From a paper:
The MCM motor of the eukaryotic replicative helicase is loaded as a double hexamer onto DNA by the Origin Recognition Complex (ORC), Cdc6, and Cdt1. ATP binding supports formation of the ORC-Cdc6-Cdt1-MCM (OCCM) helicase-recruitment complex where ORC-Cdc6 and one MCM hexamer form two juxtaposed rings around duplex DNA. MCM is a ring-shaped helicase containing six related AAA+ ATPase polypeptides featuring bipartite active sites with catalytic residues contributed by neighbouring subunits. Biochemical studies established that ATP hydrolysis by MCM, but not ORC or Cdc6, are essential to complete helicase loading.
To better understand the role of ATP hydrolysis during OCCM to SH transition, we employed cryo-EM to analyse the DH loading reaction on MH-capped ARS1 DNA, using MCM-Cdt1 complexes containing the Mcm2RA variant. We solved a 3.3 Å resolution consensus structure and separate local refinements of the ORC-Cdc6 and MCM-Cdt1 regions of the map improved the resolution to 3.2 Å for each sub-volume. Cryo-EM density for all subunits of the ATPγS-OCCM complex could be recognised in OCCMMcm2RA, however, the topologically closed ORC-Cdc6 ring transitions to a notched state, while the notched MCM ring becomes topologically closed. Moreover, cryo-EM density for Cdc6 in OCCMMcm2RA becomes fragmented, reflecting increased flexibility. As a result, duplex DNA appears merely clamped by ORC-Cdc6, and not fully encircled by a protein ring, as observed in ATPγS-OCCM22. The Mcm2RA N-terminal B domain transitions from partially plugging the MCM central channel (ATPγS-OCCM state) to a retracted configuration that creates the space for full access of the double helix into the MCM pore. In fact, continuous cryo-EM density for duplex DNA can be observed spanning the entire length of the MCM ring, unlike ATPγS-OCCM where the double helix is only seen encircled by the ATPase tier. In OCCMMcm2RA, Mcm7 disengages from the ATPase spiral and from DNA, while Mcm2 forms new contacts with the double helix. In OCCMMcm2RA, instead, three sites were ATP bound, while no nucleotide density could be resolved in the Orc1-Cdc6 active site. Within the MCM ATPase, four sites are occupied in ATPγS-OCCM, while all active sites are nucleotide-bound in the six MCM subunits of OCCMMcm2RA.
Numbering used by the authors:
A (entry chain C): 16 to 27, 36 to 46, 51 to 157, 183 to 499, 512 to 616
B (entry chain D): 425 to 431, 448 to 529
C (entry chain B): 242 to 249, 260 to 343, 357 to 385, 399 to 498
D (entry chain F): 394 to 424
E (entry chain E): 289 to 300, 320 to 351, 373 to 395, 414 to 474
Write the structure that this text describes.
């Protein structure tokens, strides 16, 4: 057996991760086009992410090093609202001052005694890389350089505010020295006022004398989200279209997160992009040079486009010259191939108008407080007039920018939409609901006691659905036992006489109840592992408590 | 009880926090089960290791008990004080 | 519904006693004859999903496995027989690190030691250094990190979750995990979910969980 | 059975009902 | 004058939260200050510290008050709230949420729950 060990390591055609459609060269072409577009998008994604990261550090350094005329000595306070432990800061290498970054996590601050010791330990380690306040006092006489300390409180909301409040007062004594300067960085997840309730008002007055306030959230006025979404519009080049349904799904799943919406947006867009090229065969015709790849199945799929049905029925109901209809009915000369080529030739000014409205709002009207996704969906639906009427200045230019989208035939083959729920089951699962349904509707998973005896966990969940909040374990065991087909169980058991212990146990008169109890014990342990139940074993194994219910 | 005229501040709950902090330090109040100064170093060690709930729960919900009973206040508080009339129930 | 929750002196000794051997007898004899063939057919059908998981792993997504039944064999087979050999020989020697989270004594320092030894030429600081190192490094995958029972007793703790969550930032590390608790998604907040970047699939298989229950005895009843 | 497990499993191989089925054109062809 | 009318010792839509988070925080306050006796009747001690409760109650009340089932976003918002420390637990070190011994309580005052209810158009004022 190998599972006893906590952890262990095991060591070991050129499969391009795509797979055939319609039950060789086409797959490679599709993969290459997909990868080209995918890398083109991720180039902009990484560029924008790096720009975002580079943006904050300039302001952070400016706040840290903007010397201000003050004769009195006090902490330099910076409030990073909406921040997180993932941020980083680098320090200037000044001439006469030695700079040390002192990180302070809540795990490193159980009491003031540990805090001072660890701060001095880090300070000494940095100084020797080139355990009390005497080290600060004697720092210049040791290393000949002035000391500047930056205490980075990585997560304020989890620190015991009593210990921090006392430690700030402890550091307050350090200002007796002329060669020491201190700066404090606060990382706050909630609003600023959450700190004001927990710290004592003496410490707040110390902090308030020299403090700066900064928001570092990614949701700052839709700026970066709009930029990323417009970059996605750019990187497609009109080679693929986004339906109203998919934009609706994005709008529905974006608002539930409020810190890292950009990451979720990028995840959803990337997943849709990778799904499209694996699903649709016509993604090959993003490159029209391969026009000779048209085949029977492509023609069938084109015939399956509802727009084709609308066009053909419009011709028929008008009693148009029957030769054109017979040409497709008899499938002769396939002029529909050139028809589809001309369809590919078509241009979509929808993207251009969507870009230009945003550019006009930003540059001509200076209206930056808007969502680009809402604008795009309003353009898709055509209610753009009301959306622009949300703002007072957009009347004349709203009338000018009025745009009307027009569909094209076989556009369904070049549109991404949420139509089968695959995009929801994979990123936003109904985890607990799925488990409940699979326990109750196990035929949704599984394809002669096998044919009757349902899985033990589902059978036990049957009783779990109805019973009381606190369950007498004996009653639950009785209820589980009553479901057993004893004779069919004996027939199942007697198929393996090769094991003597099997017959020895089974032929015992107590065997039915013993097997029922063993299965009950295993199922109850599994339920405890899943969080379904909890024993009262601290009192007795006579009662068990339910910890989950259906539907909620 | 002051009649209204035909055509005293209730201080804000945030400002009262400083007054509460002042009174908690001057030992007029005390936490529900505050042992206070421990007797020996080992007791201080076990006390500093443990984290009391009273230091974690919000400033507005910490339970306190009183050191000067209202009767003592009525003995001490001058009758010329405006709030003296409330030294009775 | 919520109404089904708002509207909801015997002893264990009244049932016959069970010995340790008898407990194993049923679990061994039934599971080899009960639902073996239909679950084998279901496994053969489900094996067709490996290319999609492989593609998602290439694109930088972590994979989380959930559902009723044991999830050891599926993850082990995917990691060993399918994933690593393709990672190696389609790019032209991938360490398949398997972590048993259901062990209640899996020290995080020991796992971090192995990871550092296998990837590197205050654990969080070292992980940050690794992340900064591998940003400019080539994107080809080096390590597969199979985390069984990402809701296990050694794993539920906040520090170990924080340690694991930063690992998925490195593209050259493949993370595969499985959970059993109903409220498993409660473990991960915004930052941890962001760094994990899971893609969720329902792998409910009704495989009899026996290895997980081995570490903690059931004979207590 | 294949479609249900494909959709529950989140597989992209499940048919998406944006295009109407070929069996529908076994009916519509007679029109 | 306005300098002498406010203390100005303060260090500085106060909470901007997702709708799911807002309703979860409404339901948690209901759990923390409504006696367990009334869960079977109303849905079918402000000055005191909040009482403890269980997640099973919170999920049921949230399902009963939101204008949702058990998708991962609900639990993600709940864990975000715990990380934001808008909801507290009965432990200090080595948080083990999944362990059955942990219990939950509200760490938010009434003055903020009222504004959240106004922003989501809910009527907590009528349940007490």
């Amino acid at each position: 057996a190998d599972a006893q060990r906590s952890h262990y390591t095991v060591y070991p055609d050129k499969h391009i991760p795509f797979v055939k459609l319609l039950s060789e060269v086409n797959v490679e072409k599709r993969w290459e086009l997909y990868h080209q577009l995918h890398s083109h998008f991720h180039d902009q994604v990484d560029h924008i992410i790096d720009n975002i990261e580079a943006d904050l550090k300039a302001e952070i350094s400016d706040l840290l090093y903007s010397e201000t005329t003050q004769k009195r000595r006090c902490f330099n306070t910076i409030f990073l609202l909406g921040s997180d432990s993932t941020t980083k800061i680098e320090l200037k290498d000044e001439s006469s001052r030695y700079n040390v970054l002192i990180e302070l996590t809540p795990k490193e601050s159980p009491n003031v005694r540990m805090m001072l010791r660890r701060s001095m330990y880090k300070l000494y380690s940095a100084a020797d890389a080139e355990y009390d306040l005497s080290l600060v006092e004697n720092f210049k006489r040791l290393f000949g350089k002035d000391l500047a300390m930056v205490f980075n409180f990585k997560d304020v909301d989890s620190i015991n505010f009593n210990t921090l409040d006392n430690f700030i007062i402890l550091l307050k004594s350090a200002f007796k020295y002329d060669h020491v300067k201190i700066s404090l960085i606060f990382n706050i997840n909630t609003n600023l006022s959450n700190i004001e309730k927990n710290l004592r008002q003496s410490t707040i007055r110390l902090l308030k004398r020299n403090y700066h306030k900064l928001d570092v959230s990614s949701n700052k006025g839709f700026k970066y989200g709009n930029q990323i979404f417009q970059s996605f519009l750019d990187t497609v080049d009109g080679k693929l279209n986004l339906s109203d349904r998919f934009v609706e799904f994005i709008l529905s799943k974006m608002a539930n997160n409020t810190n890292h919406n950009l990451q979720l947006l990028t995840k959803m867009l990337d997943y849709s992009l990778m799904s499209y090229f694996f699903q649709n065969a016509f993604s090959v015709f993003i490159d029209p040079v391969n026009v000779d790849f048209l085949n029977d199945d492509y023609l069938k799929i084109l015939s399956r486009c509802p727009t084709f049905m609308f066009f053909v029925e419009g011709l028929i109901k008008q009693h148009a010259p029957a030769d054109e209809i017979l040409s497709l009915l008899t499938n002769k000369n396939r002029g529909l191939e050139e028809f589809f080529v001309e369809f590919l030739v078509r241009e979509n000014p929808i993207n251009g108008h969507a870009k230009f409205v945003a550019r006009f709002l930003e540059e001509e009207l200076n209206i930056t407080n808007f969502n680009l996704i809402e604008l795009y969906h309003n353009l898709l639906i055509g209610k753009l007039d009301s959306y622009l009427d949300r703002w007072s200045a957009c009347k004349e230019y709203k009338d000018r920018l009025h745009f009307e989208p027009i569909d094209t035939i076989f556009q369904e083959l070049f549109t991404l939409d949420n139509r089968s729920g695959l995009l929801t089951q994979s990123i936003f699962p109904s985890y607990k609901s799925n488990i409940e349904d699979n326990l109750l509707s196990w035929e949704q998973v599984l394809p002669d006691l096998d044919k009757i005896m349902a899985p033990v966990l589902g059978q036990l969940f049957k009783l779990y659905r109805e019973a009381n909040m606190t369950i007498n374990i004996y009653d639950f065991y009785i209820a589980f036992r009553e479901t057993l087909p004893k004779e069919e169980i004996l027939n199942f058991i007697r198929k393996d006489p090769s094991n003597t212990k099997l017959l020895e146990l089974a032929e015992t008169p107590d065997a039915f109840d013993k097997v029922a109890l063993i299965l009950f014990m295993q199922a109850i342990f599994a339920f405890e592992n899943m969080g379904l139940i909890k024993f009262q074993s601290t009192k007795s194994y006579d009662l068990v408590e339910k910890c989950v219910w259906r539907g909620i | 009880r002051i009649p209204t005229v035909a055509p005293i501040k209730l201080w804000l709950k945030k400002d009262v926090k400083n007054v509460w902090e002042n009174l908690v330090q001057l030992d007029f109040f005390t936490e529900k089960s505050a042992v206070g100064l421990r007797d020996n170093a080992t007791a201080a060690f076990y006390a500093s290791n443990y984290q009391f709930q009273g230091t974690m729960i919000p400033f507005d919900l910490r339970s306190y008990q009183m050191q000067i009973i209202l009767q003592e206040l009525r003995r001490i508080i001058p009758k010329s004080n405006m709030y003296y009339s409330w030294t009775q129930l | 519904t919520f109404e089904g929750y708002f509207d909801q002196r015997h002893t264990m000794s009244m049932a016959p006693d069970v010995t340790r051997e008898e407990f194993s007898l049923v679990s061994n004899f039934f599971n080899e004859n009960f639902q073996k063939r239909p679950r084998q057919k279901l496994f053969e059908i489900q094996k067709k999903m490996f290319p999609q998981y492989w593609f998602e792993l290439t694109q930088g997504f972590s994979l989380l496995f959930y559902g009723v039944g044991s999830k050891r064999n599926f993850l082990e087979e995917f990691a060993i027989d399918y994933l690593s050999p393709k990672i190696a020989y389609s790019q032209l020697s991938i360490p398949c690190l398997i972590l048993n989270g259901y062990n209640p004594s899996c020290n995080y320092r020991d796992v971090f030691k192995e990871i550092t030894d296998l990837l590197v030429p205050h654990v969080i600081l070292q992980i940050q250094k690794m992340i900064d190192f591998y940003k400019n490094q080539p994107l080809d995958i080096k390590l597969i990190l199979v985390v069984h029972n990402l809701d296990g007793p050694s794993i539920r703790k906040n520090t170990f979750q924080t340690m694991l969550s930063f690992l998925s930032v490195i593209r050259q590390i493949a993370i595969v995990a499985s959970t059993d608790h109903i409220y498993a998604p409660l473990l991960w907040d915004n930052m941890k979910a962001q760094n994990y970047n899971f893609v969720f699939h329902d792998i409910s298989n009704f495989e009899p969980s026996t290895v997980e229950s081995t570490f903690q005895d059931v004979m207590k009843m | 059975y294949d479609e249900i497990i494909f959709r529950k499993l989140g597989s992209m191989l499940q048919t998406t009902n944006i295009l109407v089925t070929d069996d529908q054109y076994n009916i519509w062809k007679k029109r | 004058i306005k300098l002498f009318l406010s203390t100005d010792d303060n260090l500085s839509q106060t909470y901007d939260l997702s709708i799911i988070s807002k309703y979860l925080l409404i339901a948690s306050y209901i759990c923390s200050y409504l006696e367990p006796r009334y869960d079977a009747s109303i849905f079918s001690p402000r000055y005191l510290q909040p009482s403890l409760f269980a997640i099973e109650r919170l999920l049921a009340i949230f399902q009963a008050i939101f204008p949702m089932k058990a998708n991962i976003e609900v639990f993600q918002n709940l864990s975000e709230l715990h990380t934001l420390k808008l909801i507290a637990t009965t432990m200090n070190k080595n948080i083990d949420y999944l362990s059955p011994k942990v219990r939950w309580k509200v760490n938010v005052p009434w003055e903020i729950i009222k504004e959240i209810s106004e922003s989501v158009h809910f009527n907590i004022s009528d349940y007490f």
